[PDB]
Amino acid sequence: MTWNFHQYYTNRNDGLMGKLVLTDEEKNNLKALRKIIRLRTRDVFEEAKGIAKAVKKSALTFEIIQEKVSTTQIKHLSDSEQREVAKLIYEMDDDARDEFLGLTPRFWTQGSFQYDTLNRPFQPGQEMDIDDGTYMPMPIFESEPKIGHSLLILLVDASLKSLVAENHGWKFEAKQTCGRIKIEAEKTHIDVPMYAIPKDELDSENVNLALREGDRKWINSDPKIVEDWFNDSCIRIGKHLRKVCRFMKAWRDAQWDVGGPSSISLMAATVNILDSVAHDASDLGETMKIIAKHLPSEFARGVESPDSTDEKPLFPPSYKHGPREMDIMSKLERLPEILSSAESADSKSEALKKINMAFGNRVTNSELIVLAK
Ligand SMILES: CN1c2c([nH]c(N)nc2=O)NC[C@@H]1CNc1ccc(C(=O)N[C@@H](CCC(=O)N[C@@H](CCC(=O)O)C(=O)O)C(=O)O)cc1
Numbered sequence: 001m002t003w004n005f006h007q008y009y010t011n012r013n014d015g016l017m018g019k020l021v022l023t024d025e026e027k028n029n030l031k032a033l034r035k036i037i038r039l040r041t042r043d044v045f046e047e048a049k050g051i052a053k054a055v056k057k058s059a060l061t062f063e064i065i066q067e068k069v070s071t072t073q074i075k076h077l078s079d080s081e082q083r084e085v086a087k088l089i090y091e092m093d094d095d096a097r098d099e100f101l102g103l104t105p106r107f108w109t110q111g112s113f114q115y116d117t118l119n120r121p122f123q124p125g126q127e128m129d130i131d132d133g134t135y136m137p138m139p140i141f142e143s144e145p146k147i148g149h150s151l152l153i154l155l156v157d158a159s160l161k162s163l164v165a166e167n168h169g170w171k172f173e174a175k176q177t178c179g180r181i182k183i184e185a186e187k188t189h190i191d192v193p194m195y196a197i198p199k200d201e202l203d204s205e206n207v208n209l210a211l212r213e214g215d216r217k218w219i220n221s222d223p224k225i226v227e228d229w230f231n232d233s234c235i236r237i238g239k240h241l242r243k244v245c246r247f248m249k250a251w252r253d254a255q256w257d258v259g260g261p262s263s264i265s266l267m268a269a270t271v272n273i274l275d276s277v278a279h280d281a282s283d284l285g286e287t288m289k290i291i292a293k294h295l296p297s298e299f300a301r302g303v304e305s306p307d308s309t310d311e312k313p314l315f316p317p318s319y320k321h322g323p324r325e326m327d328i329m330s331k332l333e334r335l336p337e338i339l340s341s342a343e344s345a346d347s348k349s350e351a352l353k354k355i356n357m358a359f360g361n362r363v364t365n366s367e368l369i370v371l372a373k
């Protein structure tokens with residue numbers, strides 16, 4: 001009794017991959033959602049820039065500026081927020097207004113869904129986490145850019161909130177790093193962080209994330225850093241990297257209804273292990289056992305972000321562990337034992353049941369599990 005699980009994992013119909021990967025349709029529906037947001041955000045900025053251009057032509061009273069604001073999509077903000085938008089437009093200097101009039105919101109063409117490892121949600125209440133940033137090409141700024149933090153966030157909020165008003169089942173929720181649209185019926189939420197970038201390329205640093213609460217209004221955070229890291233890793237290691245990342249993310253979804261380690265911490269740890277430990281990429285069952293064996297050590301040490309400019313660990317080191325991190329360490333230690341137990345189970349039926357204690361009950365096809373060669 002030594003069971004092989006390579007097809008349990010990799011089978012694109014009945015295997016774990018077949019249960020995790022979104023259909024071409026479901027993917028296109030997320031793309032459609034994403035497109036609706038981007039269009040509305042662009043539309044809102046035009047409406048606002050429309051008012052700004054009228055002010056450049058003639059400096060209107062605040063009352064007239066406010067009336068114009070009130071009949072834009074910005075009408076979906078509160079009264080005080082509309083006043084604030086109208087006041088910011090009223091207060092613009094010539095230099096600032098010309099900047100604003102040249103600003104159109106930008107979106108990332110290279111962005112995939114979770115580095116192309118977005119899994120179908122497993123447990124009831126679990127939702128797909130989709131991020132689509134809005135990039136604001138502006139002059140490089142020291143503290144604050146000509147176009148203010150406040151105005152930009154208000155306009156993005158107006159965009160998201162105006163969509164929420166026109167679409168039943170949608171809700172808005174403001175977060176630290178982003179505005180969020182939650183669509184519970186579609187088990188989906190999409191986060192719209194807002195970044196400031198240089199007008200002329202020059203993209204290394206000076207990607208600035210807008211923070212909604214607190215003293216710092218902007219922080220340096222370039223999502224391209226982690227994206228490049230991971231894409232390069234997949235090239236260096238092989239096509240199985242994304243698969244094993246999907247599997248660990250699925251394991252996480254199965255072990256915790258809410259909570260568990262971040263997907264990125266699992267990706268960083270998995271990459272570290274596959275770079276440093278011999279494995280056979282032709283057997284994902286053997287490969288997963290190798291990953292399972294080494295994860296506890298990766299997490300115990302704390303998981304460093306692949307972005308060297310991020311001082312905060314993706315997962316805390318052992319000495320900073322509370323009940324939640326202790327819980328996570330505990331399940332990580334169980335994982336390699338679960339995989340070995342499945343491997344030596346009495347039957348196909350039992351082997352499936354045991355491995356499904358790691359990844360949840362999804363795969364129903366025991367025939368994917370085969371007697372070892
Ligand atoms: C890559 N980048 C980069 C960054 N950082 C670093 N460190 N290195 C980098 O290389 N960050 C940002 C930078 C972004 N590059 C971009 C360049 C252009 C665009 C862009 O979306 N342009 C259009 C969008 C409108 C549209 O197409 N509308 C469509 C539909 C819009 C839709 O839904 O998609 C229409 O006509 O209807 C525009 O100019 O308005 C988006 C991103």
Ligand SMILES: [Mg+2]
Binds near residue numbers: 129131191
């Ligand atoms: Mg998100």
